[PDB]
């Protein structure tokens, strides 16, 4: 037997701790018994494993958080939920946590924090996903972890400011891709593989990369103040990163399958299983974040393969070498029967890399 | 090996030229390679046919053209775009085009201007009717036919007026028609 209680903890807080106490005994039936009186719980059980108490007691310390308003509490609350919603399989209080992630966020927000927010968001889309079998979801891991980076970039902005209107501006595009993606996860919770899901997860993400954008192109507009060469490097290497995970993420939306690797310098992104109009879209998709980002682009197009590579901040004799290489690697793939032998073309090209680069 | 050296290209060019090349490289795209810098554009295509070379050379100018304020420059795109159209076998492709001689279109200023305008949609509307063969295609060849008098009325009333106002009432009605 475990025995329970939360010194009169305000009534609201009860019906997190009621339903995640019925939440329990969803398999067993007649052998499971617990009990309850004002605001005290009991639950009669020898067989249950000590996780199974874990739900309840972390549920207890997560309302004990609930009852504040403070972004570490909120962090943390989001991240016990999540552990909760992660393992469990009772989509029902999956549900009511999301509700209850979105009023936390609306209630209050700033943005350090946000990035725990964020991660647990994207763990959580990561296992709906999983759980689910839709390839966009599992992949808005990538969207949200752009965003978790966009927090990085808000919390590297206090190099820059003892906090400005950047921020404000940073929190509120971040915000707008919680409250987004939060709904999205709502509704995939509501209507499952629906087409309203597809059609939010093709909607959504624009304004994430955009937001990136702007918001690298500001830590730009101060590093060439400052002039380090490694700030210089972190605006090259993020700049490209950016670009990578995100055309990562639109690509894999289509179902193809995409392979990517990066060197600081370089990126080899390589794709496998096109249709025309996928082409169509992935090709001027790419030119339209490449020329937001202000990065060198070169692709090639033959049979059912699309083979990528680009270069930031490129000195004219360094695009011309490269050019070189990339278009070995444009050569390289074009006979490929299946992703394994794409795995062992580009393996040799990683190879021939580290012969020359 | 084929390639087209490129300069001041745009963001509707880049678009207009990607698919069309695209549109060639399904058809005949044993391999092809594109590039951008300083958001600028490259090309290198394997020895297609010279009609589809100066298809792409065309479509770049055209492109630009439509970009300009000139009304002489839009008459130049409003054709020469059109005759990229004449070369598509794909419907999508058509529509594209439409969609941009329709904001071009929306552009148009005056009789000189108009004649080549409402000429070039009369074109395009007879090479969209002469192949449908589902049952829009008989109406269309008409609707053809009802387009080619008033180019032959613009052009009539381009020639006669001596620049006095009450062309404008015209002009406009034959605008609402075009678009």
Redesign the interface.
């Known amino acids: 037997t475990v025995t329970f209680d939360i010194t009169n903890i305000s009534h609201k807080a009860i019906d997190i701790i009621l339903k995640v106490v019925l939440g329990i005994a969803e398999h067993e039936g007649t052998e499971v018994t617990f009990h309850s009186e004002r605001g005290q719980l009991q639950i009669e059980v020898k067989n249950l494993h000590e996780e199974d108490k874990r739900l309840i007691e972390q549920a207890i310390e997560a309302a004990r958080l609930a009852d504040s308003p403070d972004p570490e509490s909120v962090a943390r609350a989001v991240e016990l939920l999540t552990k909760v919603a992660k393992a469990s399989t009772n989509t029902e209080l999956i549900q009511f946590i999301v509700k209850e992630l979105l009023e936390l966020a609306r209630k209050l927000t700033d943005p350090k924090d946000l990035a725990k927010v964020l991660d647990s968001i994207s763990e959580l889309l990561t296992e709906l996903a999983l759980k689910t079998g839709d390839p966009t979801a599992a992949l808005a891991a990538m969207v949200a972890h752009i965003a978790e980076l966009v927090v990085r970039l808000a919390l590297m902005a206090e190099r820059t400011h003892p906090g400005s209107e950047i921020v404000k501006k940073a929190v509120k595009l971040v915000q707008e891709v919680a409250e987004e993606v939060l709904e999205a996860a709502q509704l995939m919770l509501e209507k499952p593989n629906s087409d309203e899901v597809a059609k939010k997860l093709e909607e959504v993400a624009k304004k994430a990369i955009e937001a990136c954008i702007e918001l690298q192109q500001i830590l730009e507009a101060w590093a060439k103040e400052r002039g380090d060469q490694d700030l210089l490097r972190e605006v090259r290497e993020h700049k490209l990163q950016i670009l990578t995970i995100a055309v990562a993420y639109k690509a894999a939306q289509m179902g193809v399958t995409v392979l990517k690797h990066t060197h600081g310098w370089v990126v080899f992104l390589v794709i496998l299983g096109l249709h025309?109009q996928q082409?169509?879209q992935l090709?001027?998709f790419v030119?339209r974040v490449?020329?937001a980002l202000?990065v060198?682009?070169?692709?090639?197009?033959?049979g059912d393969i699309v083979v990528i590579a680009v270069t930031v901040g490129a000195s004219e004799e360094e695009?011309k070498e490269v050019r070189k290489i990339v278009?070995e690697i444009?050569k390289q793939l074009?006979h490929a029967e299946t992703e394994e032998e794409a795995k062992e073309i580009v393996q040799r090209v990683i190879e021939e890399w580290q012969e020359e680069g």
């Open positions: 025309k082409a169509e090709l001027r030119h490449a020329h202000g060198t682009l070169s692709i090639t197009f033959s695009k278009k444009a074009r």
